[PDB]
C-alpha cells in the first residue's frame, strides 16, 4: 500500500530532476577542469527510486545497477558530460594508488563468456586478455593507475566493484579515499 | 451501474493527474478524471473532478480522504450529488491539457514580415487610432505635430 505523500514526493522529484536535466542540456557542457583527461573512480549511491531515461541509459553504459557498484573511468569531455547528467546518483573522484591496488586485490573479478570469476590466477588473466600487453594482475593495476591504450579493454574485462555497505563512514577531490576504505 | 462523482479542492501542487489516477484507483476502479487547469498558462487551478464506477466506493473514498492534510494543503474531497452532475464535466477528460506558448507564437507572428496590402491596412488602422488619440488628447491641452 502506497500513499499520496509518496505520490506527491515522487512527482516533485521527477519534475525537479527534469528541470535540472533540461538546464544542463541547454547550458554548455563545460566543466571548470583542465582539458587534460584524468582518472576518476565513481561509486553510485541510491538517491532516487525512479530515474529519467537519459540517466538510465548512462547508468546502463556504466553498468552500475546492482547495489553499491563502483568503477574507474576516464575524465574527458563526453564522460564529464555524462557524469554531470547523472550527478545525483553518482559520487566520484580521484583514486589513490594504494586505493586502486587494495580495491583490485581485495575485490577482483574477471568477465569471460558472461561469467564473473575471481582474479585468482594470472593464467586466467592472460587466457582472457593475453595479447594486448597485459602480463598479470599487477600489469592491469599499473595500466589502470597510468592509463594506456588498453584502458577500455581493461575496464570491460574487470567486473564492476561491489563495495560493502558502510555503517556511517557533489564533487570532492580526495575524500573518496576515505570512502573507499570505509566501504572496503 | 451508478457512477460516483467526487470533487476534490485545495489540491497541493503536483498531486494532480496521474497522482489522482493512481491513488484513487488504488482505492478502486476509476472511469473518468479531470483536473481543471488554466488555458492562459498551463497550470492546475487546484481543483479536480473524478468519476468512480461505483457511488459506494466513491462515498468510501470521500469520507476516508475528505479532511486530509497533504503537504500543508487541507484537501476537501466531497461527493458531487447525482442531482446536478453537469453533462460537460469531463469534456477534456483523459487528455493532456497542454502548455501552449501563446506569448511565443504571438511574438513569432509579429516577427514574420507581412505583405504590402496588409502593411497598408495596418497603416490605415494606425492612422485612424492616431486621429482618435489626437481627438481625445486635445481636451487635455496638448497637440502633437507628428
Amino acid at each position: 500500500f502506497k500513499r499520496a505523500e509518496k505520490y506527491v514526493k515522487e512527482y516533485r522529484e521527477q519534475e525537479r530532476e527534469k528541470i535540472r536535466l533540461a538546464r544542463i542540456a541547454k547550458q554548455q557542457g563545460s566543466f571548470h577542469i583542465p582539458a587534460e583527461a584524468k582518472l576518476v573512480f565513481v561509486i553510485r549511491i541510491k538517491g532516487i527510486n525512479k530515474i529519467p531515461p537519459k540517466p538510465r541509459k548512462i547508468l546502463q553504459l556504466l553498468r552500475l545497477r546492482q547495489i553499491n557498484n563502483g568503477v574507474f573511468v576516464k575524465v574527458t569531455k563526453a564522460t564529464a558530460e555524462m557524469i554531470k547528467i547523472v550527478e545525483p546518483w553518482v559520487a566520484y573522484g580521484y583514486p589513490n594508488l594504494k586505493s586502486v591496488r587494495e580495491l583490485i586485490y581485495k575485490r577482483g573479478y574477471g568477465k569471460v563468456n558472461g561469467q564473473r570469476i575471481p582474479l585468482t590466477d594470472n593464467a586466467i588473466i592472460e587466457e582472457n586478455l593475453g595479447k594486448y600487453g597485459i602480463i598479470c594482475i599487477e600489469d592491469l593495476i599499473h595500466e589502470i593507475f597510468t592509463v594506456g591504450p588498453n584502458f577500455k579493454q581493461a575496464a570491460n574485462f574487470l567486473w564492476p566493484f561491489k563495495l560493502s555497505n558502510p555503517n556511517g563512514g557533489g564533487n570532492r577531490e580526495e575524500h573518496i579515499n576515505a570512502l573507499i576504505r570505509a566501504m572496503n | 451501474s451508478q457512477p460516483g462523482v467526487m470533487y476534490i479542492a485545495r489540491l497541493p501542487h503536483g498531486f494532480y493527474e496521474h497522482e489522482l489516477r493512481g491513488y484513487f484507483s488504488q482505492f478502486g476502479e476509476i472511469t473518468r478524471l479531470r483536473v481543471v487547469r488554466n488555458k492562459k498558462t498551463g497550470a492546475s487551478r487546484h481543483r479536480a473532478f473524478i468519476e468512480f464506477a461505483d457511488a459506494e466506493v466513491a462515498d468510501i473514498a470521500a469520507r476516508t480522504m475528505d479532511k486530509y492534510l497533504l503537504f500543508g494543503h487541507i484537501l476537501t474531497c466531497k461527493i458531487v450529488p447525482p442531482a446536478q452532475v453537469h453533462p460537460d464535466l469531463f469534456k477534456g477528460a483523459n487528455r493532456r491539457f497542454k502548455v501552449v506558448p501563446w506569448n511565443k507564437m504571438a511574438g513569432r507572428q509579429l516577427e514574420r514580415p507581412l505583405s504590402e496590402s496588409q502593411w497598408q491596412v495596418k497603416v490605415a488602422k494606425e492612422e485612424q487610432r492616431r486621429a482618435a488619440r489626437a481627438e481625445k488628447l486635445k481636451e487635455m491641452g496638448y497637440e502633437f505635430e507628428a
Partner: peptide, 22 residues
Amino acid sequence: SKAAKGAQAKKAAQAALKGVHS
C-alpha cells in the same frame, strides 16, 4: 463483484487511516 469492490475499498480506507505496519 460489488462485495469484492466494497471489501477492497474498505481495505484501502483502513490502510490509509490506520497504516499497514502491524
